[PDB]
Structure formats: C-alpha cells, structure tokens
Write an enzyme that holds these catalytic residues in place. Structure first.
Site, mmCIF file in Angstrom:
data_model
loop_
_atom_site.group_PDB
_atom_site.id
_atom_site.type_symbol
_atom_site.label_atom_id
_atom_site.label_comp_id
_atom_site.label_asym_id
_atom_site.label_seq_id
_atom_site.Cartn_x
_atom_site.Cartn_y
_atom_site.Cartn_z
ATOM 1 C CE1 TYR A 243 42.000 29.035 35.058
ATOM 2 C CE2 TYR A 243 41.970 31.362 36.127
ATOM 3 C CZ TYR A 243 41.615 30.017 35.816
ATOM 4 O OH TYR A 243 40.110 29.950 36.305
ATOM 5 C CG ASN B 249 38.228 30.337 33.665
ATOM 6 O OD1 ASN B 249 38.154 31.016 34.560
ATOM 7 N ND2 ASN B 249 38.109 29.117 33.296
ATOM 8 N NE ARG C 50 36.567 21.019 34.593
ATOM 9 C CZ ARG C 50 37.572 22.033 34.110
ATOM 10 N NH1 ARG C 50 38.440 21.592 33.419
ATOM 11 N NH2 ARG C 50 37.662 23.287 34.449
ATOM 12 C CG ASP D 248 33.855 22.904 36.131
ATOM 13 O OD1 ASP D 248 34.401 21.781 36.050
ATOM 14 O OD2 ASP D 248 34.817 23.746 35.490
ATOM 15 C CG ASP E 13 38.886 25.165 32.295
ATOM 16 O OD1 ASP E 13 39.100 24.139 31.979
ATOM 17 O OD2 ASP E 13 38.257 25.557 33.621
#
Ligand SMILES: [K+]
Ligand SMILES: [K+]
Ligand code: NI
Ligand code: NI
Lengths: 154, 146
Positions: B50, B52, B96, B98, B129
């Site tokens: 993961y 960002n 997207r 957020d 992301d």
C-alpha cells in the site's frame, strides 16, 4: 547556467509485475499509447500533437487542464520550454471502456537548473478512432519541483 | 455532492464494474468511508502493499493496516466517487475523487486520484494511489510531508 546533473537509474519496484505481459500492449489502443510514450522522449510538440483528436484534452493534474487540440499543443510546447523527457518506463498498461492506463516512471530534466528526477506517474488515456481524446497524468508536483528546483505552479 | 468533470467518459459502462475484481475494488472503495483500518484490512492478502505515492510505501498486511490507522487518526473519507474503472492482467485502475476531511481543522477537500489495485484470488495484493499532496495539505491546513 548549470551543468547537467546525474540522471538517476530507473529501478524496478517491488510491486511491479516481474515478467508478465502487464507491461505489453494487449489491444490496438494500448499499442498506440505505448507508441505515444516512446514519442515523449523526442521532446517535440509537433510530433506529439499528431496523436490527438480535435476534441481532446490534456492535464497534468496538479497544473491547469488544457481542453482542445490548440490548448494541448500550447501546454506541451510550454512544458518543453523548461523541461525535457530523458526516459519513460511503463510498468503496467491496461484498458477498458475506451480508456488506457499506464503506471510508469518519467525521467525528467529541468532545463534551467540542469537537474533530473524520476517521477512516479499513473496516467489515463482516452482514445477514439485511434486518436487521443484525453490524457491525464497523476503524480506529486511538490516532490518534483523541490528535487529539481523548478516551481511550476502558478 | 461531487460534480463530474467534462473530461469524464460518457460511456455509461466506464463507471460500472465489468469484471469481478472491479466489483471488489468498487466495494472496497465504498468501505473506505467507514474509516476503519481493521475493517478495511480484510480485503488485503497476506503478501500485500500500500502506498499513497507522495508518502512512504507500506509492505505487508500489518504495515498496511497500521498505515491506514495512522492516516485515519487525522483524516476521514466523507465520500468516494469513481468516474472510471478498468482492468487488465490482474490489475484494476480507478479514476476517482476522494472527499477527505481533516480532523484537526475540520476542513475538507476534493482530491483527484488515479489508483491501481493488484488482486489475486479476490485479495488486494497491491494498492497505489497517485495524486498531489500539497494542494490537499494547503486546502485543509494539515501537513503530512515535510
Ligand atoms: K497489458
Ligand atoms: K468499467
Ligand atoms: Ni540562477
Ligand atoms: Ni552547477
């Protein structure tokens, strides 16, 4: 005037697919997009603008969008005034519903400072009749600006 | 509410999930607004990651869960609108917006995001992301990178 600093080597991330065709064009759109990526290192807005439709757009998301082929070329030529692509490495490419996606690393040089940096980018391409009708690149602008001393915002 | 940008595909299928990996990712997206790291971590495989991207990566499910909990201590998702979702070769991508709210200041901001997910047997083995951190920090007055 500043000498050309050291161009850092493009390393394969842990999370990058090892040998799969996640990096290979699977559709005609993806092959076009991969060819556009190869064209980037030419640093020639004339060569690049030929891939775009009239009704198109282009945005590096931390910077203002350009809508229309005319604004796109102005923006591409503008960036090429202060910046230069040295390499583009595409780890993952894919497509659905008319959109191509590239998880890549762009090796950029800032003309005025002579410094160089490897930008982690995820970008999306909209295609129509073989032509790019949208291109949006996602990345962090501050880490690039600070690494090469070229503030671009504003 | 989130307005849809003019550049959004008008293909009615580009927002909908097409494959089962994409449905999972869309449900995980819906689960983000729970702001619950222990709940979110259920979607992740044992060997996962993961990141960002403007921040350091987290390797391994445990780091992934602790990184989500750390972020959830200062911010919370209010909403997640996915404009585009697509997939190839076991990776899923989401364009997207957020809507993130900063807990210490109460201000919120609409972050433009393009995300990639790697899925094995319906398990998230990767999540990255991509977005611009500084405009978020500035909008909500919450620094996260020095
Ligand atoms: K591919
Ligand atoms: K879709
Ligand atoms: Ni000077
Ligand atoms: Ni010098």
């Amino acid at each position: 005037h500043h000498h050309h600093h050291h161009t850092s080597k493009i390393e394969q991330p842990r999370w990058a697919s090892k040998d799969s065709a996640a990096g290979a064009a699977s559709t005609p759109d993806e092959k076009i997009v991969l060819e556009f990526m190869d064209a980037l290192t030419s640093n020639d807005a004339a060569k690049l603008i030929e891939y775009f439709a009239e009704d198109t757009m282009y945005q590096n998301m931390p910077l203002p969008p350009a809508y229309g082929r005319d604004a796109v070329e102005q923006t591409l030529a503008g960036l090429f005034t202060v910046m230069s692509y040295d390499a583009v490495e595409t780890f993952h490419i894919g497509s659905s519903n008319g959109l191509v996606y590239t998880e890549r690393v762009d090796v950029l040089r800032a003309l005025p400072t002579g410094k160089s940096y490897n930008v982690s980018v995820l970008g999306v391409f909209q295609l129509t009749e073989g032509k790019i009708t949208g291109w949006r690149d996602y990345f962090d602008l501050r880490e690039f600006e600070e690494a090469v001393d070229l503030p671009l915002r504003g």
